[PDB]
C-alpha cells in the first residue's frame, strides 16, 4: 500500500539526514574545548528569598529591567516582586487556580498566564485606574497552556499540551499562525535574541525550530530519550540547550543541525525541569527533581556548582538580562535569588 | 532518535504459535520498562503485557495469561513475545510500547491513541 | 529623594500582605479534589451529587470542597497530572476491556513519584449495570480475568439483602484487584478508599466527606509521628 | 526567730496543756502492780502504763529534724519508776530514732538534689538547641511548631528558675534564716513559671485533641486563647496563692510545702493534667481504630499503640497522673522518689529529644541543610 | 492516518535540503562567544560587593 | 503538696533545707 511506500520514503529520508549530519561531525565540542581553562568551582549564595506564595510555584519570569519578576503559583495568585527590596509590587488573583506558566512583557506593561484552563490571559499592569485587570483572554488551544512568551505588547507565542504552538495577536484575540509539527505535548519554548525564530520542546523527545513570520518548521532536533521539559536559546542565537526526563541536558547547534554536548552524571537519575544560560553562555544552569540546581560548564560538560537551597522539586529558574542574578522556583512556595 | 521496529507477525492458524520481536535503538534499553499493546480491528489500543527494567516483575492481561510470554534481552536491546495457543480473538496489530521516563515504576500513556516511544506495529492475523 | 518611593512601595506591600493572609485563610479552609474517570464511567453522574477544566463547589457540614474535572484534555495525562499532587484526594471513578485499562491507570497514579502521598477515593459506579450482566450470560468477567473462577467472597464482605451472591463475589473481586495495587505499594503515605456506587444513591458526597476526614486525620497523626 | 520553730513551739505549748487537760478526762488506772505514773516529758504524752513494759508512740512534729514516721519509745521499769538516764539520773525518753536516720535521710535528699540539677541542666542544653532549630529553620514553621516553641520556652524558663532556686536559696542557711523578700519574688516566679509549664502541656493536649478527634477540618485554630491559657491564666492562681501566703501562712523564704494553700496553684494544675490524661485516651482510641481499618497485624498494632502512648507521656505530663500520690512504705516510697524525679526533671530533655531530635521531618531538613554546607 | 504520513515526508525533504556547516566550525563560534563576553558575565566573574545590587 | 506528684520538688527543697540548716536536736541527757 501507499502507507508502506510513504513510510519507506520517510525512512530513507531519515537515513539521508542522519548521514548528512555524520558527515559534518568532524570534531566534537569536547575536542575543540580541550585546551581551555576550566571555570572552577561556582559558589552562589541565596541573596533573597520570596515567601508570599501559598502553594507550589510553577513558573517565574524576569523583567527586562532585571529588577522586577513575576511568579505563578497554583494557589491562584500572580505576584510581581521587587527583587532588590523583596517587596511585592502586585498580587493578581487568577480565575483558574491551575496556572502552569507566566510571562513578563519586555515593555513591563503586561503579564501573561495560562494553565489547565486552556486560556492565555493578559493582565494590564499600567491601567489608568491603577488596579491590574485582565486585558485579554486568548482562547483556541484544545490543551493546557505550557509556556507563553511575549514578542511585543501585541504579539505572544504560546505552547500548549495539544501538540501545537500558536502565534497570537492581542487587540484581536485571534491566532495568526499555527505550528503543528510536534506529535507530543509541547512543554517549553524559547525565543531567539531576535523574535524571528523560536524553538519548542515536546514530549516526543524532539525539538523543532520555527520561523515566526512564515510559520514553518525549519529544523528538527532529536537525540533525547524522554520528554523534553525545558529549552533555552544560547545568548548568540546559534545554539540552544534542552532538558529532558532522561536526566541529561544536551546542546544543539542550529547551523550544525545536530547535538554538540551532553550534560549528564551517573549520580543524576531525576529529570530536568528548567534550563538557562548565563549572559555569556559559558555556564548552564539546570533544575532537577532532586530539589537541587546544578551549574554546568557549557563548553566542557563538567559540573561547576550546585544550588541546593530549595527543599522541594525545582520547577523553574531564570537568569536576569544583565546576568547579575539567578532566580529559582520550587514546589515549595518559596522563590530564591542566587548570585 | 527513539526507534522501535516490530518484526515477526504474519498469518497463523488457530492453535498455532508465533514469536514477536521488538528491536530498540536510540535509548538505554536497560533503564526503561517495556510493554506490549495491540489494537484489534474496530477497537481501541489494549495493554497486553509489560516487563521491568531487569526482567523480574512481569504482568499480563487476563486474556493472554498462561499463553503469552514476554522477555527482554538487555544485551541485545530487544523485546520478545512468545504467543502460544493463538485463537482468532488475538488478531490485532501488536505494538512495542515504551513508557517515557526511566527508573520509574509508573508506566504512563502506553495505550494512548497518539503516543510517542511506540513502534509502528506488526500485523498478527489468526485465521483458518 | 528616593525615600518617597521606598516608603510608598512598603505601604503597598503591606496592603498586599494583609490580603494574602485573607487568601491564606480561604485557601487552607477549602479542600481540593481531583475527579478522574473514563468515558464509560459515570463521572458526570458523580457531579450530580470549551473549558479546559471544570470546577464544582459544594459544602458538607460547613466544610468547603473544590472538586475539579479535567475536561478538554488529551489522554496523555503524565504531564498535567503532576499539578494535582497537593489535593486532599483523587476521586477515581471506574465502570464495572475497560476494567483492565482502569487497573493500569490506577497503578500508574498509585506509583507515581509525585502522587505517592496523594490518597485515592475509588468509586465503582456501574453496580446496577454489573448486577444485570453477572447473573446473565454476558458478564465477560471470567474471560477478561481467569483468576475469577478461583475467587471466593471474602469474610469481610457486606452483602446487601437485595443482591445475589454472584454479584457480591463479582464486585468484591473487582475491589480486590484495586486493593492489590494499593497494598503492594502502600507504606502509610497514601490510602485507597473503595466504594460501590449504584448511580441511584445521592450519598456519594458523604463518602467523600468521610474519606477526606480520614485522610486529614492520618495526615495529622503522621505529623506527630503517631501513625 | 524562724517560723518553723515558732509554729512548732506554739502548738507544743498547746499540746502540752491539752494532754494534762485530757488527763483529768482520762480515768484512773485500774491495772494492778506498780504502774508508772503518766506525765508529759515536755515533748510528748505517756499515759498510765504497766510496769516492765515499753510504750511506743510516733515522734512529734514540732521540730524540723523530727520525723513523724519514726517511732519513739518510753520504758518504765518493773520496779515502778521510769527508766532514768545514767548520766543525770533523771527520767529520760528515747527520741533518738527520730533523729538517728538524719544522715541517711540527708544522703538520699542529696542524690535527688543533684539528679534534679543534672536533669534540668541537661534539659536546658537540649531545649535551647531544639528551640534554636525551630526558630532557625523557617521550613518547619507551622501551628504545631509555634505551640512547641512556647512549650519549649516554658521548660527553659522553669528549669532556669529551678536551678537558681536550688543553689542560692535551698542550701544557704543564713539566707533563709534572715528571710528577705528576695526569696519570695524568686519563689513567686518559680510557682508562676511552673504553672505555665503545666498549663502549656494542656495547650498541647487541647491542640492535639482538636486536631485528631474534634474538628478535624478546621484550619488555623487561633492561638490567642492558647496564649491566655498557657502564659496568662497561671497568673491568677499564682497571684492568689502569693497573697494568702503573705497574709496567713508567711514563713522563711516560702520553702514550707505543708500548707494547704498550695492547692490554689496545684489544684488547677492537677485538674489540667487529668484533662490531658483523657485526651490521651481519645487519641489512642482513634489511633487503634485506624489500624483496625487497615487490617494491620495485631502484634505491630500493639507495638505502635504503645510507642505512641510512650511519646505522648512527656508532652502531656501523664507521669503526674499515673503516679499522683506518694506511697507511705519506706521501700515503695523510695523508688517513687527516684522514678518521679527522673520523669519530672528530665521531662524537658525527653520532649526535646522526641519531638525535635527524633522527629523524622526535622532530621531530613537538617540533613539536607547540612548537606548544602 | 495516511494524510499525516504524507506531510511527514514533505517535512523531511525541507529539512534534508538545508546547508550544514561542520561541527568544528559551529563549536569554534560558540567558544569564541563565551570568551568575548566572559568578563561581562557577573555569574562567571563575580562583581564586587559595591556593584552587586543583591548584597 | 506533701505527697502530691506536682509538688515533689517543693518537698525536696523543704526536706533539704530543714535537715541541713537547722541544728540537730540534742535528744540527749537533760532533754525530755
Ligand atoms: C541527642 C541525644 C542526646 C543524649 C544525651 C544523653 C544524656 C544522659 C544523661 C545522664 C544523666 C545521669 C545523671 C545521674 C546523676 C547521679 C547523681 C549522683 O547519684 O549523685 C551522687 C551524690 C553523692 O553525694 P554525697 O557524697 O552522698 O553527699 C554530698 C553532700 N555535700 C554536697 C554536702 C558534700 O553527688 C556526688 O556524686 C557529687 C555530685 C555529683 C553530681 C553533680 C551534679 C551537678 C553538676 C552536673 C554537671 C553536668 C550536668 C550535665 C550532665 C549530663
Ligand atoms: C520570668 C521572667 C522572664 C518574667 C516572665 C516573662 C514572660 C511572661 C514573657 C517573656 C517573653 C514573653 C513571650 C515573648 C513572645 C511571645 C510570642 C508571641 O507569639 C508571636 O508569634 C508574637 C509575634 C512574634 O513573635 O513575632 C506569643 C507570646 C510570647 C510567647 C510571650 C509570652 C510571655 C513571655 C514568655
Ligand atoms: C546549662 C545550665 C547549667 C547549670 C549548672 C549548675 C551547676 C550548679 C552546681 C552546684 C554545686 C554545689 C556544690 C559544690 C561543691 C560540691 O561539689 O560538693
Ligand atoms: C531565670 C531568669 C529569670 C530570673 C529572675 C530573677 C528575679 C530576681 C528578683 C530579685 C528582686 C530583689 C528585690 C529587692 C528589693 C529590696 O531591695 O528590698
Ligand atoms: C484561680 C483558681 C483557684 C483554684 C482554687 C482551688 C481550691 C483551693 C482550696 C484551698 C483551701 C485552703 C485551705 C487551708 C486550710 C488551712 O491551712 O488550715
Ligand atoms: C502579678 C504579681 C502579683 C503579686 C501580689 C503580691 C501580693 C502581696 C500582698 C501583701 C499584703 C500585705 C498587707 C496585708 C494586710 C492584711 O493582713 O490584711
Ligand atoms: C511582683 C510582686 C512579688 C511579690 C512576692 C511576694 C511578697 C511577699 C511579701 C510578704 C510581706 C508583706 C507585708 C507583711 C504582711 C503581713 O505581715 O501579713
Ligand atoms: C479564690 C481562690 C481560693 C482562695 C481560698 C482562700 C481561703 C481563705 C480561708 C482559709 C485559710 C485561712 C488562713 C489559714 C492559715 C493557716 O494555714 O494557718
Ligand atoms: C478544679 C480544682 C479543684 C481543686 C480542689 C482542691 C481542694 C483542696 C482541699 C484542701 C483542704 C481544705 C479543707 C481544710 C480544712 C482544715 O484543715 O481546716
Ligand atoms: C482533680 C484535682 C484535685 C487536686 C487536689 C487533690 C488532693 C488529693 C489529696 C487530698 C488530701 C486531703 C486534703 C484535706 C485534708 C484535711 O482536710 O485535713
Ligand atoms: C482549672 C481550669 C481548667 C480549665 C480546663 C479547660 C479545658 C478546655 C478544653 C477544651 C477542648 C476543646 C473544646 C471541646 C472539645 C470537645 O467537645 O471535646
Ligand atoms: C509511666 C507512664 C505510664 C503511662 C500510662 C499510660 C496508659 C495508657 C493506656 C492506653 C490503653 C487503654 C485505653 C485503650 C483504648 C482503646 O483501645 O480504644
Ligand atoms: C484519672 C484518674 C485519677 C488519677 C489521679 C488523680 C489525682 C488523685 C489525687 C489523690 C490520690 C489519692 C490520695 C489519698 C489521700 C488519703 O487517702 O489520705
Ligand atoms: C525513665 C525513668 C527511669 C527511672 C530509673 C530509676 C532507677 C532507680 C530506681 C530505684 C532503684 C533502687 C534504689 C534503692 C536501692 C536500695 O534500696 O538500696
Ligand atoms: C534518665 C536518667 C535516669 C537517671 C537515674 C539515676 C538513678 C540513680 C540511683 C541512685 C541510688 C543511690 C542509692 C544510695 C543508697 C545509700 O547509700 O543509702
Ligand atoms: C503517780 O502514780 C500513781 C498513778 O496511779 C499516783 O496515784 C501517785 O500518787 C503518783 N506518784 C507520784 C510520786 O507522783
Ligand atoms: C534507746 O534505744 C536504743 C536502740 O533502739 C538503745 O541503743 C538505747 O540504749 C536506748 N536508750 C536508752 C537511754 O537506753
| Three-state SS sequence of chain C | CCHHHHHHHHHHHHHHHHHHHHHHHHHHHCEEEEEEECCCCCHHHHHHCCCCCEEEEEEECCEEEEEEECCCCCCCCCCHHHHHCCCCEEEEEECCCHHHHHHHHHHHHHCCCCCCCCEEEEEECCHHHHHHHHHCCCCCCCCCCHHHCCCCCCCCCCCCCCCCHHHHHHHHHHHHHHHHHHHHHCCCCCCEEEEECCCCCCCHHHHHHHHHHHHHHHHHHHHCCCC
Q: Is D163 in the pocket of ligand 4 (CB under 6 A)?
A: no
Q: Cα of D112 to ligand 1 centre, how many Å? A: 9
Q: Cα of F1 to ligand 10 centre, how many Å? A: 9
Q: Are B48 and B37 in contact (CB under 8 A)?
A: yes
If phi > 0 it is left, if psi is from -120 to 50 it is alpha, else beta; for residue D230 that is alpha
Q: Which three cell numbers stand for residue A240?
A: 540552544
Burial class (CB in 10 A: 0-12, 13-18, 19+), A46: middle
C117 vs D: CB within 8 A: no
The bound ligand whose nearest atom lies closest to the alpha carbon of D248 is 8
Where b means 16+ CB within 10 Å and e means fewer, C106-134 reads bbbbbbbbbbbebbbbbbbbbbeebbebb
Q: Which three cell numbers stand for residue A294?
A: 546544578
Q: Which H helix or E strand runs over A295? A: strand A293-297
| Residue owning the nearest CA to atom 4 of ligand 16 | D37
Q: What is the C-alpha separation between A138 and A136, in angstroms, rounded?
A: 6
| Residue of chain D whose Cα is closest to the Cα of F15 | D109
Burial class (CB in 10 A: 0-12, 13-18, 19+), D222: exposed
Q: Which of D219, D279, D291, D305 to mutate to test the interface with C (most CBs of C within 10 A)?
A: D219
Q: Which three cell numbers stand for residue D350?
A: 525527653
φ/ψ of residue A276, rounded to 5: -160, 150
Cβ-defined contacts of E45-53 (< 8 Å, 24+) = E46/A339, E47/A324, E52/A324, E52/A339, E53/A67, E53/A84, E53/A324
CA atoms within a 13 Å half-sphere pointing along the CA-CB vector of D324: 11
**Angle at Cα F22 formed by Cα F20 and Cα F28, nearest 5°?**
105
CA-based R_g, chain E, Å: 22
Q: Are E23 and A26 in contact (CB under 8 A)?
A: yes
User: In angstroms, how far is CA C61 from the centroid of its own chain?
Assistant: 20
Bridge partners, residue C194, by sequence: C122
Q: Which three cell numbers stand for residue A282?
A: 559559558
- Which residue in this structure is represented by grid cell 489500543? B45
Q: Which of F6, F18, F30 minimises the CB distance to D64? A: F18
Chain D residues with CB under 8 Å of A311 CB are 139, 365, 368
Bridge partners, residue A121, by sequence: A113, A137
CA atoms within a 13 Å half-sphere pointing along the CA-CB vector of A67: 9
Alpha helices in B1-128 (DSSP H): none
- Which residue in this structure is represented by grid cell 559595591? E50
Q: Are A200 and A231 in contact (CB under 8 A)?
A: yes
Residue A163 to residue B100, Cβ atoms within 8 A: no
Instruction: Write the CB contacts of A128 (distance below 8 Å, at least 6 apart in sequence).
Output: none
Q: Cα of D171 to ligand 4 centre, how many Å? A: 18
User: In angstroms, how far is CA C32 from the centroid of its own chain?
Assistant: 11
Q: Give the residue from E21, C44, C67 showing the smallest Cα distance to A239.
A: E21
Q: What is the C-alpha separation between D346 and D120, in angstroms, rounded?
A: 6
Q: Which of A82, A142, A227 minimises the CB distance to C72? A: A142
φ/ψ of residue A217, rounded to 5: -95, 105
Q: What is the DSSP string of D67-79?
A: -TTSEEEEEE-TT
Indicate the Cα dihedral angle D142, D146, D148, D150, nearest 10°. Answer: 180
E33 vs A: CB within 8 A: yes
Q: What is the C-alpha separation between D164 and D211, in angstroms, rounded?
A: 37
Neighbours of D235 (CB within 10 A): 13
Q: Are A170 and A156 in contact (CB under 8 A)?
A: yes
B113 vs A: CB within 8 A: no
**Angle at Cα D274 formed by Cα D271 and Cα D279, nearest 5°?**
130
φ/ψ of residue A176, rounded to 5: -90, -25
Indicate the Cα dihedral angle A90, A94, A98, A103, nearest 10°. Answer: -50
Mutate to test the pocket of ligand 8, among D239, D244, D263, D266 (most ligand atoms within 8 A of CB): D244
Q: What is the DSSP string of D39-84?
A: EE-SSSEE--B-TTEEEEEEPPSSSSS--TTSEEEEEE-TTSSB-E
Taken in order E38, E43, E46, E49, is the CA torsion positive or negative? Answer: positive
Domain ranges of chain C: 32-222
Bridge partners, residue A338, by sequence: A46, A326
Q: What is the C-alpha separation between A245 and A270, in angstroms, rounded?
A: 7
CA distances from D183 to D155, D164, D174, D261 (A): 21, 11, 12, 18
Q: What is the DSSP string of A92-121?
A: EE-SSS-EEEEEE-TTSSEEEEEETT--EE
Q: Is D318 in the pocket of ligand 6 (CB under 6 A)?
A: no
Q: What is the C-alpha separation between A115 and A106, in angstroms, rounded?
A: 21
Report resolution in angstroms: 2.6
If phi > 0 it is left, if psi is from -120 to 50 it is alpha, else beta; for residue C188 that is left
Neighbours of D113 (CB within 10 A): 20
Cβ contacts from A onto D, under 8 A: 10
Taken in order D20, D26, D29, D31, is the CA torsion positive or negative? Answer: negative
Burial class (CB in 10 A: 0-12, 13-18, 19+), D274: middle
Burial class (CB in 10 A: 0-12, 13-18, 19+), A266: exposed
| Residue of chain E whose Cα is closest to the Cα of A325 | E43
Q: Which CATH number fits domain B3-126: 3.40.50.410, 3.20.20.70, 2.60.120.260, 2.60.40.10?
A: 2.60.40.10
| Residue owning the nearest CA to atom 12 of ligand 16 | D37
Coil, strand or helix at A78: strand
The domain over range D3-100 is classified in CATH as 4.10.1240.10:
yes
Taken in order E41, E43, E49, E53, is the CA torsion positive or negative? Answer: positive
Chain B residues with CB under 8 Å of C118 CB are none
Q: Give the residue from C106, C122, C116, C131 showing the smallest Cα distance to C207.
A: C122
Q: What is the C-alpha separation between D37 and D56, in angstroms, rounded?
A: 16
Q: Which H helix or E strand runs over A17? A: helix A2-24
Pairing of strands C31-37, C63-69: parallel
Q: Which three cell numbers stand for residue A211?
A: 520561523
Instruction: Residue count of chain F, please give it.
Output: 32
Indicate the Cα dihedral angle C55, C60, C63, C69, nearest 10°. Answer: -20
Coil, strand or helix at D149: helix
Residue A77 to residue C83, Cβ atoms within 8 A: no
Q: How was this structure determined?
A: cryo-EM
Q: Give the residue from D349, D356, D334 showing the smallest Cα distance to D118.
A: D349
Where b means 16+ CB within 10 Å and e means fewer, B40-77 reads eeeeebbbbbbbebeeeeebbbbbbeeebebebeeeeb
Q: Which three cell numbers stand for residue C20?
A: 494574602
CATH of domain C32-222: 3.40.50.300
Where b means 16+ CB within 10 Å and e means fewer, D326-346 reads beeeeeeeeebbeebbbbbbb
Domain ranges of chain A: 2-338
The domain over range A2-338 is classified in CATH as 2.130.10.10:
yes
E18 vs A: CB within 8 A: yes
| Residue owning the nearest CA to atom 6 of ligand 10 | D267
CA distances from A27 to A294, D314, E31 (A): 27, 69, 14
Q: Cα of D329 to ligand 15 centre, how many Å? A: 18
Sheet holding A293-297, edge to edge: A272-277, A283-288, A293-297, A303-307
Report the gap between the CA of E53 and the closest CA in chain A (Å).
Answer: 7
Bridge partners, residue A70, by sequence: A61, A80
DSSP-derived secondary structure letter, D271: H
φ/ψ of residue D132, rounded to 5: -70, -30
Report the gap between the CA of B124 and the closest CA in chain C (Å).
Answer: 19
Residue A309 to residue D372, Cβ atoms within 8 A: yes
Q: Are E55 and A59 in contact (CB under 8 A)?
A: no
Contact partners for chain E, using 3 or more CB pairs closer than 8 A, are: A
Q: Give the residue from A104, A93, A47, A45 showing the smallest Cα distance to A70.
A: A104
| Residue of chain B whose Cα is closest to the Cα of A227 | B100
E runs forming strands in B9-108: 10-12, 18-25, 34-39, 45-51, 58-60, 68-73, 78-83, 92-98
Taken in order A265, A266, A268, A271, is the CA torsion positive or negative? Answer: positive
Q: Cα of D101 to ligand 17 centre, how many Å? A: 14
Q: Are A123 and A135 in contact (CB under 8 A)?
A: yes
Q: Is D227 in the pocket of ligand 1 (CB under 6 A)?
A: no
Q: Which CATH number fits domain D102-372: 1.10.260.40, 1.20.1070.10, 3.90.1150.10, 3.30.450.20?
A: 1.20.1070.10
Q: Give the residue from A193, A310, A188 showing the smallest Cα distance to A244.
A: A188
Q: Which of F4, F24, F26, F30 to mutate to test the interface with D (most CBs of D within 10 A)?
A: F4
| Residue owning the nearest CA to atom 6 of ligand 13 | D321
Indicate the Cα dihedral angle A186, A190, A195, A196, nearest 10°. Answer: -60
D and C touch with 3+ CB pairs <8 Å, answer: yes
Q: Which three cell numbers stand for residue A245?
A: 526526563
Neighbours of D140 (CB within 10 A): 18
Amino acid at each position: 500500500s501507499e502507507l508502506d511506500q510513504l513510510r519507506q520514503e520517510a525512512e530513507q529520508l531519515k537515513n539521508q539526514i542522519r548521514d548528512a549530519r555524520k558527515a559534518c561531525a568532524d570534531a566534537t565540542l569536547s575536542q575543540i574545548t580541550n585546551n581551555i581553562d576550566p571555570v572552577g568551582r561556582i559558589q552562589m549564595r541565596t541573596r533573597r528569598t520570596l515567601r508570599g506564595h501559598l502553594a507550589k510555584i510553577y513558573a517565574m519570569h524576569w523583567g527586562t529591567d532585571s529588577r522586577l519578576l513575576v511568579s505563578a503559583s497554583q494557589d491562584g495568585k500572580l505576584i510581581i516582586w521587587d527583587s532588590y527590596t523583596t517587596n511585592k509590587v502586585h498580587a493578581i488573583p487568577l480565575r483558574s487556580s491551575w496556572v502552569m506558566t507566566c510571562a513578563y512583557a519586555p515593555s513591563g506593561n503586561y503579564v501573561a498566564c495560562g494553565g489547565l484552563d486552556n486560556i492565555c490571559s493578559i493582565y494590564n499592569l499600567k491601567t489608568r485606574e491603577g488596579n491590574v485587570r485582565v486585558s485579554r483572554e486568548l482562547a483556541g488551544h484544545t490543551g493546557y497552556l505550557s509556556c507563553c512568551r511575549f514578542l511585543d505588547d501585541n504579539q505572544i507565542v504560546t505552547s500548549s499540551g495539544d501538540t501545537t504552538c500558536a502565534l497570537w495577536d492581542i487587540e484581536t484575540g485571534q491566532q495568526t499562525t499555527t505550528f503543528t509539527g510536534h506529535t507530543g505535548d509541547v512543554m517549553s519554548l524559547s525565543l531567539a535574541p531576535d523574535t524571528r525564530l523560536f524553538v519548542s520542546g515536546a514530549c516526543d523527545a524532539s525539538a523543532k525550530l520555527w520561523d515566526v513570520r512564515e510559520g514553518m518548521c525549519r529544523q528538527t532536533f532529536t537525540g533525547h530519550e524522554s520528554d523534553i521539559n525545558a529549552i533555552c536559546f544560547f545568548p548568540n542565537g546559534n545554539a540552544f540547550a534542552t532538558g529532558s526526563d532522561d536526566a541529561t541536558c544536551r546542546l544543539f547547534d542550529l547551523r550544525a543541525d545536530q547535538e554538540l554536548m551532553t550534560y549528564s552524571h551517573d549520580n543524576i537519575i531525576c529529570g530536568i525541569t528548567s534550563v538557562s544560560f548565563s549572559k555569556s553562555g559559558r555556564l548552564l544552569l539546570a533544575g532537577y527533581d532532586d530539589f537541587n540546581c546544578n551549574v554546568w560548564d557549557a563548553l566542557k560538560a563538567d559540573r561547576a556548582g550546585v544550588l541546593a537551597g530549595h527543599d522541594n522539586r525545582v520547577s523553574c529558574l531564570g537568569v536576569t538580562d544583565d546576568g547579575m542574578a539567578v532566580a529559582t522556583g520550587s514546589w515549595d512556595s518559596f522563590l530564591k535569588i542566587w548570585n | 532518535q527513539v526507534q522501535l521496529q516490530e518484526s515477526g507477525g504474519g498469518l497463523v492458524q488457530p492453535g498455532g504459535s508465533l514469536r514477536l520481536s521488538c528491536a530498540a535503538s536510540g535509548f538505554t534499553f536497560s533503564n526503561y520498562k517495556m510493554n506490549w499493546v495491540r489494537q484489534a480491528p474496530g477497537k481501541g489500543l489494549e495493554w497486553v503485557s509489560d516487563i521491568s527494567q531487569s526482567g523480574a516483575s512481569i504482568s499480563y492481561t487476563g486474556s493472554v495469561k498462561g499463553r503469552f510470554t514476554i522477555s527482554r534481552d538487555n544485551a541485545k536491546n530487544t523485546l520478545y513475545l512468545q504467543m502460544n495457543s493463538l485463537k482468532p480473538e488475538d488478531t490485532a496489530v501488536y505494538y512495542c510500547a515504551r513508557c517515557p521516563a526511566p527508573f520509574t515504576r509508573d508506566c504512563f500513556d502506553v495505550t494512548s491513541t497518539t503516543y510517542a516511544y511506540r513502534g509502528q506495529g506488526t500485523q498478527v492475523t489468526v485465521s483458518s | 529623594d528616593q525615600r518617597n518611593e521606598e516608603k510608598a512601595q512598603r505601604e503597598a506591600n503591606k496592603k498586599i500582605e494583609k490580603q494574602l493572609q485573607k487568601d491564606k485563610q480561604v485557601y487552607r479552609a477549602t479542600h481540593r479534589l481531583l475527579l478522574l474517570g473514563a468515558g464509560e464511567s459515570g463521572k458526570n453522574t458523580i457531579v450530580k451529587q470549551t473549558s479546559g477544566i471544570f470546577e464544582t463547589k459544594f459544602q458538607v457540614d460547613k466544610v468547603n470542597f473544590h472538586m475539579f474535572d479535567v475536561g478538554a484534555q488529551r489522554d496523555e495525562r503524565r504531564k498535567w497530572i503532576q499539578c494535582f499532587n497537593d489535593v486532599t484526594a483523587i476521586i477515581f471513578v471506574v465502570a464495572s476491556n475497560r476494567l483492565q485499562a482502569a487497573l493500569k491507570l490506577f497503578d500508574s497514579i498509585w506509583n507515581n513519584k509525585w502522587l505517592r502521598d496523594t490518597s485515592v477515593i475509588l468509586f465503582l459506579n456501574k453496580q446496577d449495570l454489573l448486577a444485570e450482566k453477572v447473573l446473565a450470560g454476558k458478564s465477560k468477567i471470567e474471560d477478561y480475568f481467569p483468576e475469577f473462577a478461583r475467587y471466593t467472597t471474602p469474610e469481610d464482605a457486606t452483602p446487601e439483602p437485595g443482591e445475589d451472591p454472584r454479584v457480591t463475589r463479582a464486585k468484591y473481586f473487582i475491589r480486590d484487584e484495586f486493593l492489590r495495587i494499593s497494598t503492594a505499594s502502600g507504606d502509610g503515605r497514601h490510602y485507597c478508599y473503595p466504594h460501590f456506587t449504584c448511580a441511584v444513591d445521592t450519598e456519594n458526597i458523604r463518602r467523600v466527606f468521610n474519606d477526606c476526614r480520614d485522610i486529614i486525620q492520618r495526615m495529622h497523626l503522621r505529623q506527630y509521628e503517631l501513625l | 526567730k524562724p517560723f518553723l520553730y515558732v509554729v512548732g513551739r506554739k502548738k507544743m505549748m498547746d499540746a502540752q496543756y491539752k494532754c494534762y487537760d485530757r488527763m483529768q478526762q482520762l480515768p484512773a488506772y485500774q491495772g494492778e502492780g506498780p504502774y508508772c505514773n503518766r506525765t508529759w516529758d515536755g515533748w510528748l504524752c505517756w499515759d498510765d502504763t504497766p510496769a516492765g513494759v515499753l510504750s511506743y508512740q510516733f515522734c512529734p512534729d514540732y521540730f524540723p529534724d523530727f520525723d513523724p514516721s519514726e517511732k519513739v519509745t518510753k520504758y518504765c521499769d518493773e520496779k515502778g519508776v521510769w527508766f532514768k538516764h545514767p548520766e543525770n539520773n533523771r527520767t529520760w525518753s528515747n527520741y533518738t530514732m527520730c533523729n538517728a536516720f538524719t544522715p541517711e535521710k540527708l544522703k538520699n535528699a542529696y542524690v535527688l538534689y543533684y539528679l534534679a540539677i543534672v536533669g534540668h541542666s541537661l534539659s536546658i542544653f537540649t531545649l535551647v538547641i531544639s528551640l534554636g532549630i525551630f526558630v532557625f529553620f523557617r521550613s518547619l514553621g507551622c501551628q504545631r511548631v509555634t505551640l512547641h516553641k512556647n512549650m519549649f520556652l516554658t521548660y527553659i524558663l522553669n528549669s532556669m528558675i529551678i536551678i537558681i532556686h536550688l543553689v542560692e536559696v535551698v542550701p544557704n542557711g543564713e539566707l533563709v534564716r534572715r528571710d528577705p523578700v528576695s526569696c519570695k519574688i524568686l519563689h513567686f516566679f518559680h510557682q508562676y513559671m511552673m504553672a505555665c509549664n503545666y498549663f502549656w502541656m494542656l495547650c498541647e493536649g487541647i491542640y492535639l485533641h482538636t486536631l485528631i478527634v474534634v474538628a478535624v477540618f478546621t484550619e488555623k485554630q487561633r492561638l490567642r486563647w492558647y496564649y491566655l491559657l498557657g502564659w496568662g491564666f497561671p497568673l491568677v492562681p499564682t497571684t492568689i496563692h502569693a497573697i494568702t501566703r503573705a497574709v496567713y501562712f508567711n514563713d522563711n523564704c516560702w520553702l514550707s510545702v505543708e500548707t494547704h494553700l498550695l492547692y490554689i496553684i496545684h489544684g488547677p494544675v492537677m485538674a489540667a493534667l487529668v484533662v490531658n490524661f483523657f485526651f490521651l485516651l481519645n487519641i489512642v482510641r482513634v489511633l487503634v481504630t485506624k489500624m483496625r481499618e487497615t487490617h494491620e497485624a495485631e502484634s505491630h498494632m500493639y507495638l505502635k499503640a504503645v510507642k505512641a502512648t510512650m511519646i505522648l507521656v512527656p508532652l502531656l505530663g501523664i507521669q503526674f497522673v499515673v503516679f499522683p500520690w506518694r506511697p507511705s512504705n519506706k521501700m515503695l516510697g523510695k523508688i517513687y522518689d527516684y522514678v518521679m524525679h527522673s520523669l519530672i526533671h528530665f521531662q524537658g530533655f525527653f520532649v526535646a529529644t522526641i519531638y525535635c531530635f527524633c522527629n523524622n521531618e526535622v532530621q531530613t531538613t537538617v540533613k539536607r541543610q547540612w548537606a548544602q554546607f | 492516518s495516511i494524510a499525516q504520513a504524507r506531510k511527514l515526508v514533505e517535512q523531511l525533504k525541507m529539512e534534508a535540503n538545508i546547508d550544514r556547516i561542520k561541527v568544528s566550525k559551529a563549536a569554534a563560534d560558540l567558544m569564541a562567544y563565551c570568551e568575548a563576553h566572559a568578563k561581562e558575565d557577573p555569574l562567571l566573574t563575580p562583581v564586587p560587593a559595591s556593584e552587586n545590587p543583591f548584597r | 503538696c506533701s505527697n502530691l506528684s506536682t509538688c515533689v520538688l517543693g518537698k525536696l527543697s523543704q526536706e533539704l533545707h530543714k535537715l541541713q540548716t537547722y541544728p540537730r536536736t540534742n535528744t540527749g541527757s537533760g532533754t525530755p
